[PDB]
Amino acid sequence: CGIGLYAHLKGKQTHDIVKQGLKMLCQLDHRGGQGSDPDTGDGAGLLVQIPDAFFRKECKNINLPEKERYGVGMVFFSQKEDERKKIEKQINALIEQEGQVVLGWRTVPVNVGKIGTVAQKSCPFVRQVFIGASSDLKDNLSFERKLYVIRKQAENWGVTEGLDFYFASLSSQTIVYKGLLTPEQVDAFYSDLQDEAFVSAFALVHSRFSTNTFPTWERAHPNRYLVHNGEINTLRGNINWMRAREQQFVSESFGEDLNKILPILNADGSDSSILDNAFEFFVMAGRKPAHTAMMLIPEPWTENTHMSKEKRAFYEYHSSLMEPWDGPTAISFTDGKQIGAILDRNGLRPARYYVTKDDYIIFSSEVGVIEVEQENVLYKNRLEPGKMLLIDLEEGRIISDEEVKTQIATEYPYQKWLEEELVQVNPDPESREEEQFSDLLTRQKAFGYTYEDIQKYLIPVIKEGKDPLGSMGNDAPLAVLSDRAQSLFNYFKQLFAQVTNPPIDAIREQLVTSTMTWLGAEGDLLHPSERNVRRIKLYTPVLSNEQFYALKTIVHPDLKSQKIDVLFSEDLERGLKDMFTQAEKAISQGVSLLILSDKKMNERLTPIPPLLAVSALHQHLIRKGLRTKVSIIVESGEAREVHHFAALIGYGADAINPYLAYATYKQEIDEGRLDISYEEAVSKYGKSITEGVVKVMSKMGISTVQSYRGAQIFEAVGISRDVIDRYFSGTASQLGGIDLQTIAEEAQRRHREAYQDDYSKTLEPGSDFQWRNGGEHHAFNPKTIHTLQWACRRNDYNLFKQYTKAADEERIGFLRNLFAFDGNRKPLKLEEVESAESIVKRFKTGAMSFGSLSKEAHEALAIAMNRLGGKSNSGEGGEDPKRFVPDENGDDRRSAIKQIASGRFGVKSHYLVNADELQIKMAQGAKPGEGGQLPGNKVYPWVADVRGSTPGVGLISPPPHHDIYSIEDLAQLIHDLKNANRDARISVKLVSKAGVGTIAAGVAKATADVIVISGYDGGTGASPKTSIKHTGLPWELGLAEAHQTLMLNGLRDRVVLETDGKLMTGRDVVMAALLGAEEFGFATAPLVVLGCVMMRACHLDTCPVGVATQNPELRKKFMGDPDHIVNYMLFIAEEVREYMAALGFKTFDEMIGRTDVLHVSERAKEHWKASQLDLSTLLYQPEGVRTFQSPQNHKIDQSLDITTILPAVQEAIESGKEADISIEINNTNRVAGTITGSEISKRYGEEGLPEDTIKLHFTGSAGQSFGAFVPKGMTLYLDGDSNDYVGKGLSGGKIIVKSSEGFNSASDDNVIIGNVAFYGATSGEAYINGRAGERFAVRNSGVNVVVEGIGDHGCEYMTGGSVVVLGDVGKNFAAGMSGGIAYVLTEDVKAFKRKCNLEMILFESLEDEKEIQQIKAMLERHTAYTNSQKAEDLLDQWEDSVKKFVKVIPKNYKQMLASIEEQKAAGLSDEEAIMFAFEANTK
Template sequence: VDPVGEGQLGVFMVFLPTVDTVPARTIVEAAAQREDLRVLGWRTVPVGTTVLSGTARRSLPVIEQLLVAADEAVSSDDFERKLYLARRLATRQVEDDAFFICSASSRTVVYKGLFLASTVEQFYWDLIDPMFETDFAIFHQRYSTNTFPAWGMAQPFRILAHNGEINTVQANRSWMAARSNDLASNLWGDRLSDLNPLIEPLPSDSASLDNAFEVLVRSGRSVSHTKEMLMPQAWENVGDLSDEMRAFYEYHAFLSEPWDGPAAIAASDGRHLIAGLDRNGLRPSRWTMTDDIIIVASEAGLSPADEIEATATGQLGPGDVLFVDLDDGRVIFADEARRRLAAKAPYVEWVTTETQTIHGPFDDLQDERYDATKLSRVFGYTAEERRLILQPMAQGTDPMLSMGHDTGLAALSEWPQRLPRYFHQAFAQVTNPPMDPIREKLVMSLRTYLGRRGSILEETAQQAHLLELRSSVLSDAELQGLTANTDPHFRAHSLDITFDATSGTEGMLDALDALCDSASAAVVDGVTILVLSDMGVTATRAPLPIVAVVGAVHHRLIDDGLRLHASIIAVSGEPRDAHDFACLIGVGASAVYPYLAIEQVRSMAVDGAIDVGPVEAQENYRCSLETGLLKIMSKMGICTIASYRGSELFEAIGLDHEVVDRAFRWVQHRIGGVGWDRIANDIIRRHADFETGDEDPGGYYKHRRGGMPHIAAPRAVLALQKAVRSGGTAQWEKYLGQVQDDRPALEIRDLLDIQAVGPAVSVEEVEPIERIMRRFTTAAMSLGAISAETHETLAEAMNYIGGMSNSGEGGEDPARFGTSRNSRIKQIASGRFGITPGYLASAEEFQIKMAQGSKPGEGGQLPGHKVTPAIAALRHTLAGVTLISPPPHHDIYSIEDLAQLIYDLKTFKPLARVSVKLVSGPGVGTIAVGVAKALADGITISGNAGGTGASPLASIKHAGSPWELGLAEAHQALVHNGLRSGLSVETDGGMRTGRDVIIAALLGADRYGWGTVPLLALGCKM
């Protein structure tokens, strides 16, 4: 190789396909030459494959380096940009999953792969070559938790290494795609289009974060600036933040939503090096400094010799950053680094002079623009909703309910369904903890900005010219303030979202298409506030489904390259609870004005149905919605509404692909069914009652005669109690008729037929009843949620039949240990109440509860008045003190933390099994694989239909998935990874009959949990 000048050598570190490397090599060379780089040749990287596992060896790519040179006139930064463009071009052109460019730089080289961390130098022989020198290194060891292992997805990536999860990655990817058409930067000239897509179609959240870092760093920002922009500290509610720093963070919030989630990162562009944490500090990061070295690692003890000579040590806190200038050899801590960043531009002036705040109070006047009674029928309001949803919210409380979800899937219901009922909220478990929106409210924010956004690659005063709202929930005064604003930069335009009620499905879809056309044309014309309103409903005009409208317009504007030019405001009579708002914001709305729900609340106060005034009732309602939104966001560990907006973090169960493809492209979608015809028919059926129809009887939340059917209806409960008391098959058949045979299909398993695989066998050949019953457990129910008598009865009954009862969270009377009343499964939940050495020693199995089927991603709270002296004694607390079980375990923020707890429990009692309770949802299979790798003995997959002592209504009805989906996914993922053998898989959540057990067994379960049915059999009042 011809010698080149210092800084003029670039290295592509490339994973090549094993079958034929020539095409990929040719493409990489051509991409480099297109950037006027001189190709010097290819180098085979020496590796030692003996350290690889069989799986890693089978997928091992050809690993080579392409050496290139730049002219002496090319600056170092321009050289990096040329290498970046060449890498992007080659990546787009090579269509082979085995191909991956690990790095392309004149400053850094990335060595990574699928091998144990301790064998890295045995695999890459370059790293033990005496001539190989570097002044820094970024090293990360991990195992895949949310993605399946692949060579290209190993860490570090090109700029950074990331320990954690980006909970908001779906929204981040979507908004980065929307920014593609609004890029502006003098550095790139006419090459801006070559930067797209900004985020490559890779499965890893860490890879996407690296893509975002890379494009911003190559566009002129430092790695520390990029970190503070994409992963800012929690600045919104911090009172002692300087004006300069507050303005810096607020300005960058105009440019980008945070990449939110538990994260410790180390990043470098080859000249500067940073280590930093997310706003919550949910990953450890400790530093040690000597006279000539600084080490940052997740744990102390990485280099004992250096720690002995340490001159300073410490750890990074939430949002912290540590900066190393490699050119100057200086270590700069957060305060100084941030002061430098805040002085780079007049952020205080820009934010103070350009940004406008919109705030307007509620009033007690009736809105005369519509007939609330008629619209209530059209939008399906019921007396039940007013009593259970709106009334508590108007009084400032969260709507709660016990029992579980037994009305089945919206797609299977014969009753008209609103679109949000098809959406199931996503939640975090194990690998990325949920948040506590009450006690960690400091780091959360609903602050919302409206208006046209500028390029993410540059900083100007114009980009601060936005409107600010306290939250996404609007009052009428705030809506009027938006639409009447005379600033030409905030042109508002209202679009009617109704259609001819006689035109059927075709008319509805034509109206939706026309609406999207009108929205796009309005934005092209300069509109920056797009108001979508169904206030124009009349006797002949029916409302388009608001969630589909917002989703369709959102994606149409992305497709047209216009999404960042305007904000979407939903003005609708349909949304009433926090789930409805989450759906609207999740599919792209910036703010929502629920005019009909607000009128209902005002009317309740005026009529004396609640004991607060109309203005206070409306404000309470808004606060309840805001609290509900924070709870839904926190289930996914998301702190800011900006990062939740457009995330589409839902699973649509039972919606046809034609619906999802048109309006909800990012929504998880595994089971189809309902198409536009059913959606249109449901709207038209409700609209038929506009003038004189009867109000929907309700029954969605609680059983009501003439209302929506419930599986656990009073007749079914009575039939069960008669059956268990009689012991005869006749009564049992009546019970089966009520809950299984004689009711409409409401659940996924109702649609499944059991296929015979051969001729029938004699009963003598079937597993004996005694052995079958050993596979039964009673689901975790804490002493306090149920009475002591019930708790003991369940334990005694399960021990009698050979099954196992689960103590639940809350401890157990030591007098029961070692007796027939002992719960053989002892649960370990986030509050750790009642967990003592004696409690643990009495267990045959430990269950670590990471989530609960009725409220995944949420914690629990036992009010002080329910903490009796007896309960307090078992939980080792004081009577009358409210007890809190936080959403996450505060010692489990990662799969490694879970593995540590499993190890500790097995060390304490080696003969006891350790199982982990998960909740069914998309991706639970990958999480189950991670749990198995953490050496759990069993996994429980809970469905969303399980009972509960008390949970928010929005969680009972709209969070989690049926166990059939999660069980099948977890079983298949474990089998695929060779981890199913020796691991028990249990399922619970709505088990009622022997047929349910058979279905669960066929889908992969070998243990079966029962909760509500045993309680009903005992005669408990629910």
């Protein structure tokens, strides 16, 4: 998986470059995984220039004109012939009517037998078509325009006919070969490639991963022009916006051909094909390829202070007319005579390229793709973010990005246009009026406010400056099942990114975010001038009362305003049609802003759900092709949560005016509460809501509000498919559900009750985040809680049965409660079924953070589960190594499931090797797309010591896995962990979601042994409240979809699904097993057994029962006992066995997957809305196998480690004697050392060996994740250049990286390491002889490193150690750095000041003699081990170097170090001094 190109700059051509490109593809092959069989090709292809020599030599019956005056087509046909010749005639007719002369047709010979079975079965026919050029076509640009017109017309005719054929490419400078072929198979299949007549200038390539096991020849790229990497998270809003602008595109170059080319994009096409179509249209429109690429993929232009004014104006102008296309991507396009290469606005993929004395640029994903002469290599650079690697074959030079960008910016007076044409809407300060309705209570009840909602969501926002937190994630029944009337918002659940893309962070990565919003009407995109930018622009989506009134009162003729009453009486269809009529009438009149107002609403007129109204208006406008001419502002009372806000922006609303919330704040301030002033309160609320919207955006990964605005990132749960298609087209829904009539009835009921309200003047208490008697039902009610506790403490079975009955029946809690047994089968005696000891081995405790829990509770859980024989778990907070030895009494506190979270806090050689299985926390049920925060107050020394950080320092866990940028990286990490612990099983933790079946299939291909699907009902230590309530989906849908997709693809017999989340009863366990579960996880229930009372205050760290609090005073109140947990598990097992007797099932694998025994209960039909659900999706059993038998064969064998290193090093490791060896390593060898490190750690442990016991040498390019998990005492001399993730999870030892021996240029100035290095390491040394990549030392926690320059975001989340940069530094350095030191060398002090992020770092100059001596010793070792000229010169000029050095240290780290040093000097013990300093700091 990846890309590649081998281009000759000066333009000279030979077959050698094509052969080298094929070799490059073959080498790149290793990154991908295995599908059904290794022979199948997941997708690959190659691109070249037109081979006129070969064509003239081979065709022999075409009078081929000169080089530039004809084009070559490539068409894929089915196996049949009648449709083939019909399409051939029709294409000839198209060409003839367009006026070009068809030269002829040709058939490409192919070797079918050289291909796997599936691709042989799907093998399509290939014919190349030659196009002529008329004398009128003077310019090749016009020729390409006509060819594009012909291709689009042919595609339109084909889709109208319904046939199945595809144009691979139709251009005069590019011909593309592709298919479901492995690279070793492509050359054999396309026998044309074997001829020695091809002469090309460049040769682009690409290999796909095929997340699903059912790809098609058409989908696989290289596409027509460009090769694409990663995924685009804005591909629904993208298509909607593009279709909207489609009807309004107008230009002169295409003339009337826009009518022919009306469909400009393939709706069914994938992200790469859609991007290629849009890019090709834009570049044919009359823009340069570089210009359109910059337009489509802009740099961060807002919030960035390192950009030139011309560039900032350029991007401000283009963002006003075209939205950005966010997501991990590495574009590499072509236009025949020019080439380019780009990374996304965040640079989430690697791209390292070479240059030689013969002008052979080698741009590829990794470094060692092909063998190159180190005596000829000239540059080893990296394509940094926001830098255009552009090549021009005719000129034969690498044109510099700086000058390309400068001249593009200066081509027009964008700065003057922005300065002049912007519209000012300065509000009048004397027009103030604090609005009041005098019906505040009535309106609040109508819109669904509650006193709980107010006092727990509005005041805390102002008090804390942020959204309030929580714990014990939502367990209330879905809105569709809840009997109480619920607003339409609850039916929509947010989404997030699991695989193929990371969840980007916001607070630390603020430079990438962009919250600029444009209001008005866009102009002519193809010929834009000043009317695209004569528009209003906002900083935040939310608005204040004064701002909203100013917008409404603006009377400028170009920017008009209209108010549309979004209300209805009886017929929702009539209301929506009337609203459409007002909208279209206003557009015809010429308005540009629409105001959807819920005001003026009385007992006879009720409000449409604002989400539904906005979605309907947006869809109608997009369909009629007028959305670009208007701006939809929304003023709805029911807008007070970040969830509601984000839903409105995502589904179309231009701005929100929470007038009801503002009036509520006015009332509270008048009463006396919330003493802060009204204006300050309004501003704080707006800022907090904008921050929440940014957080919700960061959850998914869309970093631009403009992109998210079009993007529809919600998944309706309980809305009918017909309604979704009508109004929410593109949204994903599984069960269908309620209808428009039901929604109208619900709204009318709520409105009528609220406007009746003739008994009291108070708001009924809410029950969303707390339980109040008579309110919304919750899974854990006090009845269930104390019944369970009493039964567990008494060991009585009748009480437990009563608890199960109460928990299950009497209400509708979850989807699984709608399933019932047929009841007509053959019961079997309880003594004939599998036993409880066999039952209990398939249970888990779920991840339990040591910081969140107390030591007593955690050890009780571990002891109980280990005694029972299941598999306990350890949270992301690591674990004290003292728990790896059983106690004298026989207790075993060791955790069988070691979790590898984003923090990588306790990851170490010992911590990983002493385990039984490994999980990868891709996400949790509550806060999937978010990280965490553990401030100084809550981080105690007894937690910091375990987590390997300084006491009393606020730790930050980044949301994404910085080692996971795609499924390929996920597979690489899985292989790394398997190599680290060969004797363990790898696991992944997912969350139910749309497409989770596809993600599970991709993971299974990535060779993850166990997949865990966790519903959003699961708990959490801390998370934002809206993330608690409106994130994820119930695990039932996720498990059903994953099982169906896996067993359809054929990989269900290679993985072991699991389940967790509110598994409170053996009925729930049986439901999960029938749905396809194998092992289960119980986390919330064991806490209740231990003594938790579901108080929902874990985040507060003030547990009254002392179950989730670190305070010793509260810990003294603990009363738990492992016997209670054992009794709970035994009772669950016995109840499950009783149901097994009832159902007549003999064994687990025998029952599993037998969903035919499930039918809907009559209670669902009785329910007034739950009866409208479609359950056939879950009740469906395709043929296949339904149990794990195969061993999930890994590729641990044949690795360089086992082959060469270990066989001569067993004696050294066992005898503790020194040994030296030299090895040749190529890029295929991935890890190269983790196995030896694991062996050393297992044999000895944390202590390791004496310094420099094993001295491994290496040569040539290294593989990805080289030298990961290396323990202390090892030393890896790598005399070459490496790939990403160097020294991942280091736990001691040295790593010396020096450029090749034949390389004589500035190795200290040429990059020698990949993006991320030393991620999550704990202690060690390093000496890198060159620049590093983006995000260097992401989570260094004790490793001292020496580098000559680093990329961007370097030293992001350090918590210790030190860094010594001998050169420049990228922007946003030390972003969130909460600990450690960074002696960054620099010359331009002020430029360094500007580059660094000033939030949480303090700068100094070296004055301490000990610091100076430490730096001197580090540089001395660096020179002694590397022979670096920069280091030698610095040692020589030490006198100037000490002055020129710059030191960086966080405030809290500095203060804590000073305090602990003062205490130690005073002469107090280490523990007492640490405690006293922590108390003083966090009083």
